[PDB]
Design an enzyme around this catalytic site. Structure first.
Site, PDB file in Angstrom:
ATOM      1  N   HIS C  40       0.847  -1.217   0.000  1.00 24.86           N
ATOM      2  CA  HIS C  40       0.000   0.000   0.000  1.00 24.86           C
ATOM      3  C   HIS C  40       0.876   1.258   0.000  1.00 24.86           C
ATOM      4  O   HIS C  40       0.309   2.335  -0.172  1.00 24.86           O
ATOM      5  CB  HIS C  40      -1.045  -0.028   1.111  1.00 24.86           C
ATOM      6  N   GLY C 142       4.447   5.974  11.842  1.00 23.94           N
ATOM      7  CA  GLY C 142       5.210   5.312  10.765  1.00 23.94           C
ATOM      8  C   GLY C 142       5.612   3.896  11.150  1.00 23.94           C
ATOM      9  O   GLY C 142       6.795   3.547  10.947  1.00 23.94           O
ATOM     10  N   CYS C 144       3.832   1.092  10.058  1.00 23.73           N
ATOM     11  CA  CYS C 144       3.553   0.210   8.899  1.00 23.73           C
ATOM     12  C   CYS C 144       4.866  -0.429   8.458  1.00 23.73           C
ATOM     13  O   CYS C 144       5.864   0.313   8.355  1.00 23.73           O
ATOM     14  CB  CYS C 144       2.938   0.954   7.717  1.00 23.73           C
TER      15      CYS C 144
END
Lengths: 4, 300, 300, 4
Positions: C40, C142, C144
């Site tokens: 993503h 942050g 991910c």
């Protein structure tokens, strides 16, 4: 207790 | 939830060694050409009751100490004592030696422990130095000589070495210059810790963390004074709050738009009335092992 | 207390990189000559609603991807997709690549997360895969592409990568072959998790840990059958217990001299009557993020 | 939420  | 995180442990892992003296094995910290461990490694089961460490250490040769770094036997070329910490000079500087300082932390401050078994990293956990200078922690199978540490930018700050367990089953140890935290001695004698109080400033940091994570039920209309808060605090075995503690919470106050004395009023009511079967960040008790600095770090 | 420990993180630290695609930055895992991160990263804020990942990825060149390992810009020579994981071929094998496998874990199993900000290790915590395949954890600045892992002897078993947060604020992600845990998709649409149940076998492991650490008040005279236990369990949102769960607890039973169905009888009463303002290992709630394997590991 |  200082074992170990 | 809101996770109690430890610092990444890698820089410490490469410094952990096994130290054996006769039948006694525990953990050592290998920095440059020096291994640090608890001096009580030189003690026989007899000796632990009233050891004369100078006499015991004089009796030991370099060759009485077996230092294993993974598969490598390290050569001990020197042995000495700084307070309660044994210092073994080896003929090889640790090539994995990180940048490091030795710091002495304050009661209520947090740090990570790399728990080790016979020189082998086993686990990492975050804890607080209790107000009575004890550590609630690790089950302790060969955990003596496991170290506490903060990472500050690129630097490992070593702040703690595990030496012993107290009657209550809490842990005690030293800074890396071998001075005990609290009134404890490396002698097998009954030793009492002080009253263990709750770290109020940490509880307030964590209520701030709860608000940031949208957990808001415990906020009330009330405010309070530091004076009136501290009378209630002392009734429930909570440390008194000072203006410096107020100042330390400033960033969490400003971010949340909740004044420190308003959060203090929230904590006052929680102490007086309990939690009525509710939870905060999925805990049924108030958590005191996050500093204001820990919450700011993790809420960025 | 009895500490929730994470695995030492060092072997994982040396593999964490920053991955940037336009204005999107998150964490990547650099093993041999391949960087793994959530696909993503190739999405614009528009794209996230119903992305065609094949079309989006076809549109990207090698040079649309910025990979930073500390101070080093890595050269992307290839880009591809395995399910929901992006695979960036770089012109350099990670010289810190540990021995590793990719494993898919089961709901109720535990693992360590190395939480990272923009490719930089920030913290390590221990968690469980919830029965509904979600993760309660890290605040997520942050975060991910942060990975979950077990260390098995000398081998890192990578089992999880963080992809997203759900409405409830729990986390979802994939194995390292890019298959989601649970019924979730990497698309910004409202997605429900199942009912989150308590991991009964873990709660029993932890009561065993409590006995081993001398915390014994909750033991009763009663026994029970698996059948009668599971009727009560299901009433309170606890997973049913099976014979395999009984067998898995065998070492803790044998060590403590407490049969599994007797501990089950203890848990039954705790569910029916609550804790009467008492605590177990200093928690006011039953803890379900320790496996039977975790307790055995830490009680040795 | 897949930000970031």
């Amino acid at each position: 207790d200082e074992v170990d | 939830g809101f996770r109690k995180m430890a610092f990444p442990s890698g820089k410490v892992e490469g410094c952990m060694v096994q130290v054996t003296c006769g039948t006694t094995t525990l953990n050592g910290l290998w920095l440059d050409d020096v291994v640090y461990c608890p001096r009580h490694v030189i003690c026989t089961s007899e000796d632990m009751l009233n050891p004369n460490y100078e006499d015991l250490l004089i009796r030991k040769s370099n060759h009485n100490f077996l230092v294993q770094a993974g598969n490598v036997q390290l050569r001990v070329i020197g042995h000495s004592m700084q307070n309660c910490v044994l210092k073994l000079k080896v003929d090889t500087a640790n090539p994995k030696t990180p940048k490091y300082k030795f710091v002495r932390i304050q009661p209520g401050q947090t740090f990570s422990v790399l728990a080790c078994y016979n020189g082998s990293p086993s686990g990492v956990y975050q804890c607080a130095m209790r107000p009575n200078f004890t550590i609630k922690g690790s089950f302790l199978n060969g955990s003596c000589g496991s170290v506490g540490f903060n990472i500050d930018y690129d630097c490992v700050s070593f702040c703690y070495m595990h030496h012993m367990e107290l009657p209550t089953g809490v842990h005690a140890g030293t800074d890396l210059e071998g001075n005990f935290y609290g009134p404890f001695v490396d002698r097998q004698t009954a030793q009492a810790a002080g009253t263990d109080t709750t770290i109020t400033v940490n509880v307030l940091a964590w209520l701030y963390a709860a608000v940031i994570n949208g957990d808001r039920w415990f906020l009330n209309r009330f405010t309070t004074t530091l004076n009136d808060f501290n009378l209630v605090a002392m009734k429930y075995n909570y440390e008194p709050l000072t203006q410096d503690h107020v100042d330390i919470l400033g960033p969490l106050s400003a971010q949340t738009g909740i004044a420190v004395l308003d959060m203090c009023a929230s904590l006052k009511e929680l102490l007086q009335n309990g939690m009525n079967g509710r939870t905060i960040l999925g805990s049924a008790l108030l958590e005191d092992e996050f500093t204001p600095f820990d919450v700011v770090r993790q809420c960025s």
